[PDB]
Each structure stands twice: as structure tokens, then as C-alpha cells.
Design a protein around this ligand. Structure first.
Ligand code: NAP
Ligand code: TES
Ligand code: CL
Length: 325
């Protein structure tokens, strides 16, 4: 089934998604200009056909640049590349959804995105600020209306600006909001959430699977562990003894074991690397497979704890992480 040259899996709207892509979030402060563009190019040369991005990562112009260069030289056609962009919290107001997607299209200089997803279920104060809190540091929460925001998303697909629609960081209750929606035109095909062997998302995955929603594993290698936003209490994922042990068995790194685990069970992974060797390393996951014994054993590593808990927002009506799943 899955191979380096062919590893796209079905989405419920008849489209398909490469089961591995390149993540592109990088701390703007300490990232060299051009590093994203260079990485996307290397990834495409390597065999990646899926790139995950977001306007708020401040490098979507580099993503577009890289994709267009590869199309221009004839490495890929547009239809061979799958780009996922994201609608941020400050742009949830229905009237803003389309202009927000149009900005991303203009930044990429592309005609459409393959997947456009609601970044988080929480709405913030609209404005030239990505993360708006007041002087006292109170997160200016805007009133969320997910159904109305989703309707604006649907109109974007109707207009042909995007092939597939999805969400990110949505719990069961939030997905059911959309799924049960009166007059639902386009159901979510994708839910992008933290996922890896310390958090196999067993319940959310079964639930998503019942509705033909595909899970995309963000931070599939356990994040870069930046303390200013990541929960550095847990030990680094790539140090797990089991994962490293299985690595030895297959002559593979802990990262490659981690990625293989998630794809082998139909979860899309979007590991981020701006390093030449590691970009290649992460893609080499089609020449082996894990035994049912091993898959079960890795699953069992499931802590049911999160590296990305977003505690600073736990007091938003739509905070997704309270429910069991
Ligand atoms: N929907 C959301 O809310 C959300 C949230 C977070 C992230 N995301 C998306 O998911 C993507 C990936 O998650 P993530 O960036 O947070 O973290 P990640 O992909 O799990 O891991 C990234 C970190 O691991 C390092 N790394 C990559 N490959 C490695 C390897 N083979 N061995 C050892 N280290 C390796 C990278 O450094 P180097 O670059 O130097 O290799 C980077 O520091 C993000 O870039 C973004 O696209 C989405
Ligand atoms: C946590 C943070 C706001 C949320 C950002 C985070 C960088 C990583 C990140 C990636 C996303 O795609 C969702 C939002 C987040 C989680 C930013 C770093 C500083 C700021 O406080
Ligand atoms: Cl946005």
C-alpha cells in the first residue's frame, strides 16, 4: 500500500492527502530568512508532497516561493502538491473568513489551497494582533460561533478557493457541533491535533474514524520543546527506551519509529525539520513496518498527557482539552 512514491490516503470528500508532510512552524526570532523556503525545496526533492503551514507562522511567502519554483522547473505539477493552511483565532468572524483565505492565496501566489482548517476553536479579538491580551495580560477572548464560522468556510470551497475543509484542536463536542449542523454542506475531512506515542489519541481517533475524519498528527515528534509554550515536564519523546530499542532492531532512529507508528495506523504526520539530513531522515519510513506486537507496545506508551496543553487559554468557553476527548 504505502510507498515513497505513493502514500496518499482518501479524504471523505473524494480528495486525498499524503500521509506525511513537512511542518513549517519555526520561531520567527531565531530562524534565518529563507530557511523555510530552502527546506520546502529539499522536502519536495526528497519526495514530500504535503506541506503544512499557516499565515501566522510568518513564512507562508517562503512556502509559496518554494512550491512555485518546483512547479516552474517541472519537479511537480500543482495537483501533485498538497498545501494545508489555517484560519487563526483572530479571523473567526464570518465576514473575515474569505478575505483571510484570499490573503493566504495571495501570499502563496496560488489559486487554491488543498486544505484550509480552523486553527483553534477559540476566537480572539479581531485586529492586527495575533495574540491580543490587555495591559494586565488578560487574553481578549472574542465570542466564538463555530457554526457561522464554518458556513463562511463552506462558501470558500463553493467558490473553488480550497479543495477540502477541516479543523484543528477540536474536541468531540466541537466536532459534533459541526457534524450535527442544520444544512451542513461540507463536513470536516480532517482534524489536526497533537498526536504521538505518548498520546495516541485513542478516543478522538475512534470518534473521528466513525465520521470518516482523518487525524493529522501535529508535533508528531514531540515538539521542539520550547518552554515558553511547551510543557517541558515530560521527558523528551525521542529518548523513550522502547522507541530507541525498536530503532536498533530496524536500524532506524526513534523519530522514524515514531513516524512509522502513526502512519501505519492511518494517521497523517507533519514533522517539522529545517535541517537537510533530518528532512530526509523523517521521510525514510516506507521501507519497513512495525509488527502488531510492536504497534501495540508503542500504543501502550500512551501517557494520555499533552506536550501542548495551552493552559494560558484554559479559561476560554471553547478550550478543547477539558473533555475526556
Ligand atoms: N494545529 C496546531 O495547532 C499546530 C500546533 C503545533 C504545530 N503544528 C504543525 O505541526 C508541525 C510539527 O509539529 P512541531 O513543529 O511543533 O514539532 P515536531 O514536528 O514534532 O518536532 C519538531 C522538532 O524536532 C526536530 N526534529 C525534526 N526531525 C527530527 C529528527 N528526525 N530527529 C530529531 N529531531 C528532529 C526539529 O528541529 P530541526 O528543524 O532542526 O530538525 C524541531 O525542533 C509544526 O511545524 C506545524 O506545522 C500545528
Ligand atoms: C505560545 C505562543 C502563542 C501560540 C503559538 C506559539 C508558537 C507555536 C504555535 C503554533 C501554532 O500553530 C498554534 C499557536 C502556537 C502554539 C507561540 C509562542 C509564543 C506565544 O505565547
Ligand atoms: Cl490567519
Amino acid at each position: 500500500d504505502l510507498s515513497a512514491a505513493s502514500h496518499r490516503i482518501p479524504l471523505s470528500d473524494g480528495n486525498s492527502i499524503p500521509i506525511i508532510g513537512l511542518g513549517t512552524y519555526s520561531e520567527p526570532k531565531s530562524t534565518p530568512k529563507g530557511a523555510c523556503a530552502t527546506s520546502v525545496k529539499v522536502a519536495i526533492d526528497t519526495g514530500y508532497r504535503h506541506i503544512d503551514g499557516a499565515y501566522i507562522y510568518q513564512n507562508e511567502h517562503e512556502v509559496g516561493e518554494a512550491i512555485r519554483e518546483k512547479i516552474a522547473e517541472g519537479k511537480v505539477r500543482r495537483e501533485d502538491i498538497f498545501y494545508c493552511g489555517k484560519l487563526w483565532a483572530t479571523n473567526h468572524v464570518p465576514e473575515m473568513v474569505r478575505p483571510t483565505l484570499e490573503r493566504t492565496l495571495r501570499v502563496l501566489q496560488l489559486d487554491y489551497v488543498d486544505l484550509y482548517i480552523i486553527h483553534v476553536p477559540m476566537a480572539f479579538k479581531p485586529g492586527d494582533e495575533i495574540y491580543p491580551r490587555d495591559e494586565n495580560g488578560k487574553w481578549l477572548y472574542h465570542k466564538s460561533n463555530l457554526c457561522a464560522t464554518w458556513e463562511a468556510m463552506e462558501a470558500c470551497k463553493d467558490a473553488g478557493l480550497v479543495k477540502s475543509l477541516g479543523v484543528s484542536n477540536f474536541n468531540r463536542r466541537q466536532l459534533e457541533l459541526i457534524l450535527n449542523k442544520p444544512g451542513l454542506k461540507h463536513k470536516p475531512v480532517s482534524n489536526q491535533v497533537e498526536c504521538h506515542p505518548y498520546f495516541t489519541q485513542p478516543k478522538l481517533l475512534k470518534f473521528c474514524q466513525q465520521h470518516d475524519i482523518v487525524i493529522t498528527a501535529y508535533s508528531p515528534l514531540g515538539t521542539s520543546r520550547n518552554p515558553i509554550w511547551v510543557n517541558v515536564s515530560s521527558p523528551p519523546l525521542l529518548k523513550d527506551a522502547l522507541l530507541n530499542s525498536l530503532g536498533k532492531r530496524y536500524n532506524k532512529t526513534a523519530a522514524q519509529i515514531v513516524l512509522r507508528f502513526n502512519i501505519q495506523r492511518g494517521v497523517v504526520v507533519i514533522p517539522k525539520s529545517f535541517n537537510l539530513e533530518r528532512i530526509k531522515e523523517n521521510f525514510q519510513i516506507f521501507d519497513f513496518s512495525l509488527t502488531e506486537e510492536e504497534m501495540k507496545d508503542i500504543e501502550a506508551l500512551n501517557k494520555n498527557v499533552r506536550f501542548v496543553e495551552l493552559l494560558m487559554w484554559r479559561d476560554h468557553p471553547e478550550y478543547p482539552f477539558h473533555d475526556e476527548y
